[PDB]
From a paper:
One highly versatile encapsulation system has been engineered from the capsid-forming enzyme lumazine synthase from the hyperthermophilic bacterium Aquifex aeolicus. In nature, these structures encapsulate riboflavin synthase, an enzyme that converts lumazine to riboflavin. In the structures of the AaLS variants, the pentamer is the common and exclusive building block for all assemblies. Here, we elucidate the structures of the AaLS protein containers by native mass spectrometry (MS) and cryo-EM single-particle reconstruction techniques.
Author numbering:
A (entry chain AE), B (entry chain AA), C (entry chain AB), D (entry chain AJ), E (entry chain AI): 1 to 161
Write the structure that this text describes.
Amino acid sequence: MEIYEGKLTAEGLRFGIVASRFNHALVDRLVEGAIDCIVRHGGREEDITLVRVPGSWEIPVAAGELARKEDIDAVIAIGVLIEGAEPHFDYIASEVSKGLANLSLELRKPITFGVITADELEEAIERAGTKHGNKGWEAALSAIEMANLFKSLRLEHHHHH
Amino acid sequence: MEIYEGKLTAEGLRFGIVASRFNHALVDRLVEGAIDCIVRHGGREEDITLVRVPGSWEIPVAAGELARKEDIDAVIAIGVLIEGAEPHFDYIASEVSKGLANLSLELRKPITFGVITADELEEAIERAGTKHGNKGWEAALSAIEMANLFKSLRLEHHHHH
Amino acid sequence: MEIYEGKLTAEGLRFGIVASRFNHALVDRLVEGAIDCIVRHGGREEDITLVRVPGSWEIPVAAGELARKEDIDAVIAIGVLIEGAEPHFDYIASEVSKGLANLSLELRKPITFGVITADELEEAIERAGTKHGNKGWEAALSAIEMANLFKSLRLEHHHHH
Amino acid sequence: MEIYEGKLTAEGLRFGIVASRFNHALVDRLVEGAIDCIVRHGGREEDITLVRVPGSWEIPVAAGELARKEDIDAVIAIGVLIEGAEPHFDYIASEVSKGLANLSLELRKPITFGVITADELEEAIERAGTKHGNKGWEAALSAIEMANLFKSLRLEHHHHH
Amino acid sequence: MEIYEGKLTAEGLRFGIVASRFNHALVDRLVEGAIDCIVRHGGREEDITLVRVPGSWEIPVAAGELARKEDIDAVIAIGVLIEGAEPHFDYIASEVSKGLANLSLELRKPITFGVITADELEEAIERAGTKHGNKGWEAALSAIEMANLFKSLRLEHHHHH
C-alpha cells in the first residue's frame, strides 16, 4: 500500500495569509496565532505573505491572486463573520466558502478556511481571545500538513516523470 | 435491450481512498472497512492508494489529485461529519458533496460518498456495532460496481471505435 | 415565424436509461413505464440503453458517460429518493438536480430527470398504480419530444452550414 | 501469524442448492437471490446444481448425497418453515438444524443454512419485499467464503505434503 | 443449469413400510393409503415390504434393518402418537424423529415421516374423513419422488465413473 500524508514541519515552505479588517479586535488576534504556529512549527516568517482587505466579501478575490504566484505553496483564509448584518450574512458566508472551494480545485493548491463564524461577540471573544482554540492556529496547521501533502503528491509526481 | 451493470469482482483494479482524521475512533473502522471489502472481493491492496487529510474540508482538493493519476479507477471518499459547530457543519457539508459531485462529472471517474453523518457519536456507535452497516464497506462496494461498470462501458466503447 | 418543436414519434431514435436499484419495487414500476411509452410511440426496444447503479448518488457520473457515446441521443434518468436517509436526501437530491442539469448544458444533449422524491410510501403507491403518474411514462415522453426537437435543431443546423 | 480466510471471488467454483416446493411463493424468491449473488460475484451458473424436494424434512438426506459428488464444493440449504403443523415445525426444524450440522462435520465440506423460520408469512414478506435481506443471498455469500476457505485449508493441505 | 428432481412413476422400485399397530382403527387406513399410492402410481406390490411392530418406540430399530437390506430403495415410517399420557409422548416423539433422522443421513437412503400426531383421536377422525389428508398417501408420495431423485442422482453418479 502507498500511504501519503503530511508531517507538520514548516521547513522550506512559503505561506499566504489573507486578512480582513472588519471586527479587527478578534481577527488581529487570529493572525497572531497563525504566524506563531508557523514559526514555532519550524518555519521562517519572511515567507509569510499577509494581504489585508476591508471585509469578508473580498477574501476570495484576493486569495485567487496569491495562489497564482508560483512561490506560495498554500494559502490561509482569515476572516470573521458575526450576525450583526442580517441581509448580507447569508450571501457573504455561503459564497466565500463556495468561492474558496472552487479556487482550490481549479488551481490545485490548498486553501484552508480560517474563518470564525461566531453567532455573537460573546462566542467570538471567548474563542479567539481566551481559549487555545485559536482558530488561526489550527487552519494554519492543517495548511502546513497540506503543503507537505502536495509535497508528497508532487515529489512522487516528478520521480515518476 | 443493451443491459449494463457491474458484477462485483475486484480483479485487476486500482482504488483511491481519501481519509480524514477527525474522530479517528470511527474513521479508522471505516478505512478498515474499505480495505477489507476490497481484498475480500478479489482485489490486491498494493494498488489501493491511502491518503490522510485533517478534516472533512480538504477531502475534495485531495481527491481531485487522486483522479488525475491515470492508474486509479475509482476513488472512495471517507470522512465523518458530526454536529460540533453550527457555523462549520452546514457550509462545509454542502461544499464537500458539491466538490465531490462536480469533480466526478469532470474527470470522468467515479467518486463515492463514504462519509458518515451520524447525528451523535452514539449514532455512529449504532452503525458500526448494532448492524453490519459499516459505511466504508458499503460505499467501497458501490465503488467496485462503478469501476466494473465503467470498464464495461469503456471496453464496449473500445469495440465500436 | 420559424416554429421549432418535437412530435411524439419514437422511430429512428436511440435512448438512454439510467436505473438505480434502491427501492427496486418502485423503480421496476417506473422502468416498465419508460420502455413502454418508448416502443409504443414508435420505437424498437433494441437501441434503448439500460444502465443500473446502486443508488441515487451515482445517477450523475453514470448518465455523464452515456450521453458521451455517439449513438445515445436522449437519456432518461430513473431513480428514487424517499426521505429515509436524512443527509443523503438533502445533499444527494440537491446535487443530482443541480448535477444532471449542468451535464445537459455541457454535452448539449437532452437529459431528463425521472427521479421521484415521494415523501412517503402512499405517494409511491398512487404513482405505482397504472393510473398514469408513472413518472417514467411522462419523463420518457418529454425526452422523446426533446429527441425529435434536437433533431429539428441539429438537422436545421446542417441545412444552414 | 497464519490467517486463513476466504475472499469472495466465485471464480471456478461449483455449488450445491437444495430447494423445497413448500410455500414456494417466497422460496422461489430465495433461489433467485442465491443464483444472483453467485454470478454477480464472478461465478458462472453452469456449475450451479439445483435440487428439488417436497417438504422441509428431505432437505438433509438429499444434500448429504450432493456433497458426496466430487465436483461440489459447497452446498446451500434452502427451505421455508412457517408454523403450519405442530409435529412438522418442532421436530423437523430441530432435526434439520442438527442433521445439516452433522453432515458438514463428517463430510468435511461446508453446508450453509438458508432456511427461514419466519413465524408468519408476513415476516417473510418483511424479510423479502421491504428489505434486501434475501436470506439465500447471504447464505450463498457465506458459502462462497466457505469454499474459498476450504480452498485455503486444502491448498495449504497440499503444499505441506 | 442442472435440475435434478423426482418425477412420480413408481416403476422398477422396491419399498419398505414399518407400521405400528396402536390405535389400529386409523393406522390400517394409513397402511392402505401407502399400498395404494404405490400400486396406483405404477408400482407392483410384491416388492413392498410391510413390517409390523407393537408401539411407537420400536419404529427406528426396525427401519434400520430394512434400510440395510440392499434391495429396499425407500422406507416409509408409519406410526401414531396420541397424548394418551405426557410421560411417554414427549420423549418417544423426540426420539423416533431423531432416530429416523440419523438412520437416513447415515445409510444414505430416504426415510419418510409417516407418523400422525393428532392431538386427539378426533383430529385423526377429521384427518381421515373431512379431507383426503391420508398422511400415509402423502409421505408415500414423497418417498416415490425421493426414490426417483436418488435414481436421477445415482444414475449420474455412474455415468461420470
